[PDB]
Amino acid sequence: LVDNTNQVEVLQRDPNSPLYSVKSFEELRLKPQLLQGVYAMGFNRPSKIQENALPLMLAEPPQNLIAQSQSGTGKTAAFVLAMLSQVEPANKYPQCLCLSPTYELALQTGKVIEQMGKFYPELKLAYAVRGNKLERGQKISEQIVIGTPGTVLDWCSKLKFIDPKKIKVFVLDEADVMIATQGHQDQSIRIQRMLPRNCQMLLFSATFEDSVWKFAQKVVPDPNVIKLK
């Protein structure tokens, strides 16, 4: 984790209902196997960004979020949690959905999930990325699906691999890198419109140009907002 002398700014979706700043994971009341997962990874104290992110994300019920912080802050960790803490392994079908901007980050965020979910039994990942093997007629029984948006949108729409009206969580990672990639922005927006209202929408980005901002607002309704200097 990179050091951060500057402080986080938290625009809460509900101004008159403050809740922030967990300075420990034990405070969070995480599934025992998840909190073990966390320990396993050498995580000690939550990171600056997680302190504020996780409460919102892990609220009862959970809240939506748009988050802006630089690399090595703990974005991924933070959402890996988001998802795993909603995922019921015993239910063999996708419930959590993660759009990545490159193939080579869908795999990297995979490893982080798989490592963290280590102590969930029968937890399996699906990778909706260029050159997966899945023939038609098939349906996915993996509870999480990481991938890049087209291939994912293909999975919900055309190929009927995934029924998105069963997703509980939806992350968008690197929302800046995403918009600057052909197709992606529109592709993601079309995935999103078929998710169910209750689904949690989490969106993350290094930078935050108007474009990115404007984009966030089509995708993440009733959002809490976080920016770190």
């Binding site: 052909q182 992606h184 474009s211």
Partner: protein
Amino acid sequence: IPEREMKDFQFRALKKVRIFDSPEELPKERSSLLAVSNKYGLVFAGGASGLQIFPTKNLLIQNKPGDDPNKIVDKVQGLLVPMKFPIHHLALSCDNLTLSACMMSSEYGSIIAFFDVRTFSNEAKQQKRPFAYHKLLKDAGGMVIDMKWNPTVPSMVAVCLADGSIAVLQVTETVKVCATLPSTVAVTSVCWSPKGKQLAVGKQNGTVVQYLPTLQEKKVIPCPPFYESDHPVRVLDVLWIGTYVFAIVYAAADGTLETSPDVVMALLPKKEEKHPEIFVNFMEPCYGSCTERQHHYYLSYIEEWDLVLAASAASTEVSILARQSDQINWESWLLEDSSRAELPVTDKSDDSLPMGVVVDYTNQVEITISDEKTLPPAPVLMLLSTDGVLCPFYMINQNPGVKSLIKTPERLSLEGERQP
């Protein structure tokens, strides 16, 4: 039925241009609204708010390292040619000299204005009028559902109507009816043979018939066996790729646009073959997200790449069927996430859908892939969207052996213009 991941073909987009203003309502009815000059590098955008002529090189803007590829270029300099009535179709004779616009007025019924193209390039003519009309003599019935110009006979065009009827026209310095079949034939769609020697018309019973230009019936292609009774399809659109090679879109006869259309390749036998008709089926390739428009399939062959582009009214994606190295068969291609040709989401968050489709070959500008690497100029697929937005994508192809399809344009000389 087969499919194939294609890594060596990529639609790489240029910046999106706003032409018309986002219409209040959804352009439901069937329509083709782009023509192109590949001879003299021009493009013809119609609509219910004028006709717009652009030098093609003005519509194509490469994205620099930094741009949002979804940000629009609002307006770009062209010609506006005002129009009393709203254009439901655009089209162009093979020599490149006759734009054929198709309107619907409330006091004439449907009609067809033929402009001479020199006129648009003729400065001393501020009012750019057409030289000939053609009063089809019908109201809604007369809606020009499909209209096509002979590929090698510039004077000859084949117009085909909402009501099932069809007529073949000659257009020189004036208009002659060569032939007209009445509604009771139930023509649904139209296409010339490659050499322009015959005309193929798809109908409502489900068959595609072949006609001499004088509408004499020569060959009947039966309705594919697998569409059994109770679920009666109808040709929707028909592409004569080769003497015995056809792309043929079908669809329900009960208009239940809820069902998606099926593309079919049809390899026909020959006079020394008593072989049945081989109909290979590549079902709903362009996935129908919509069911509010009446279906189109824009279709167009690229002979020197031996592949067929195909877009639908009711889908946001361009699909590609390619002929195999097998030389008979076909395959659907599957392209990378960021290498597709799809219409953007309206800023009101809805799907923009196709109004017209064209390929420009005149382009000379070489693709600036990165800082350091530049690739030769590619043909440019373009799309008119129901949002009034045009969507240029280069068609990079790298399959070995395929050759450069680029053709330099000309300067239309005014010589021989026809006056009204």
